[PDB]
Write a protein that binds this ligand. Structure first.
Ligand SMILES: CC(C)=CCNc1ncnc2[nH]cnc12
Ligand SMILES: CC(C)=CCNc1ncnc2[nH]cnc12
Lengths: 266, 262
């Protein structure tokens, strides 16, 4: 009841919320950094090395053993850029046809595709799917290759699990990429895309649910890239309407903006 | 009186933040070194034939140097028992050398010659890492425990910078589940090591920070409470603050101490 006890109640909410936001941001940063390393791994060991040291079995083993390096990711995979002129060749060599993600059916003719050729076993269902056949993934692929940096999607429901999450995509370039490249040069030099699924729904719940005081607090995360159209990234709910705190979150993609809001159940 | 209280609060805040930064950067480096140990296992031992070589290791480690902020370099030393030495040297077209003089190694029961190296530590190639006592002890404890280990602070090769070495064991696929120490030794393939150059890279980390001229910072290895060893700072023997550090090796203990000059 007391006004003095209310000041401390807010102080505790601020502290709890700020700590959770720091944990989320730090663990995502750690995961992005290890995805960057995987992109370098594919470049060095698959493309640069003659012959390639990476087959599906090798990729699966390495990513399984390093899963702890990528705490907020449910799986990683590598999609190769295939232009239509090359598609029949690519399919004959791999002995499978490029499929659409919505039904796993053979892809119709498209100018280019991004079929998954290597996958962590946790996302084995991605193998042979054209990652340009989902709009969130397609937009991510384009912005990754044009900018040279890790990029994030808006929140959407992921394949197979239908869990609400975001996808992280990094470009992989050919050795022909010029120094100080233009966007056009980046596109021309694109080899493929290293993608990771941030399963926010399952993995952020797991992270938050183990923390002391979790039952006292309601935590929501929003994508606020468009101020007038906030999108739920994490969270549902009967909460305390009188008091809230907003904690800062920076997931590292300047194209996107996010925030965390905590309230008491009370 | 009020100003003395504020002075204490600033000291605690300054010291705690530096400790956090140092612990976090150490942690990130340790984790990325662990990934490299896994990479050598997967590519050099699990694949047959081996699908990693010096060229590839040098490229990958150069390109990922940013992932390992406090490390001057990383290298992989392979376990070689004496009966295998002749075959090993013929395969590599070099002789196993001592760390102190680069002379051909006398006969030893076993050796840990560096076979892969980041170019920043290229001078380690062919050196027997068991011919230096800090590295030797680290190698033994790494392989017997199955986990990352740290040395005491000591002066590193070439640069003479005061630092600590981080060593991870790499095992053969014959390693049993829930292995004994004896099983770990038998299954050892080699050792992935990284040099934490404290004298240079921690100075770079902490030295640039605002407020640095107002305080004295030390990091101590306090594994032996009665014989603390300087890891960072000067050799000097009221108002101090101790901030916690955990560098991840249960065998070792560390602390940061900060004081005002006046
Ligand atoms: C480029 C690449 C391999 C992206 C990874 N994308 C995805 N990874 C895993 N699940 C998903 N569901 C929808 N998109 C998903
Ligand atoms: C096992 C392994 C390769 C250890 C790395 N050890 C070291 N690495 C870099 N420089 C050093 N100077 C002395 N020991 C050093």
């Amino acid at each position: 009841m007391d006004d003095a006890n209310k000041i401390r109640r807010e102080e505790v909410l601020v502290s709890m919320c700020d700590q959770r936001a720091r944990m989320l941001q730090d663990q995502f940063s750690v995961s992005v950094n290890h995805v960057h390393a995987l992109a370098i791994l594919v470049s060095t060991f698959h493309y640069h090395k003659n012959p390639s040291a990476i087959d599906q079995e090798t990729f699966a083993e390495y990513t399984a053993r390093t899963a702890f390096e990528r705490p907020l990711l449910s799986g990683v995979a590598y999609a190769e850029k295939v232009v239509n002129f090359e598609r029949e060749m690519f399919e004959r060599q791999h002995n499978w046809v490029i499929k659409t993600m919505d039904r796993g059916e053979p892809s119709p003719v498209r100018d280019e595709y991004a079929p998954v050729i290597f996958s962590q076993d946790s996302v084995s269902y991605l193998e042979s799917l054209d990652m340009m056949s989902g709009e969130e993934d397609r937009e991510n692929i384009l912005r990754a290759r044009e900018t040279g940096k890790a990029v994030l999607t808006s929140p959407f429901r992921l394949l197979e699990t239908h869990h609400l999450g975001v996808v992280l995509t990094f470009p992989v370039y050919k050795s022909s990429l010029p120094e100080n490249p233009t966007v056009e040069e980046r596109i021309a030099a694109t080899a493929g895309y290293l993608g990771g699924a941030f399963d926010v729904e399952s993995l952020v719940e797991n992270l938050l649910g183990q923390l002391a005081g979790n039952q006292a607090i309601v935590v929501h995360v929003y994508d606020i890239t468009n101020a007038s159209d906030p999108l739920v990234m994490y969270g549902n709910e009967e909460a305390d309407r009188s008091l809230s705190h907003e904690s800062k979150l920076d997931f590292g993609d300047p194209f996107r903006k996010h925030k965390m809001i905590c309230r008491y159940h009370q």
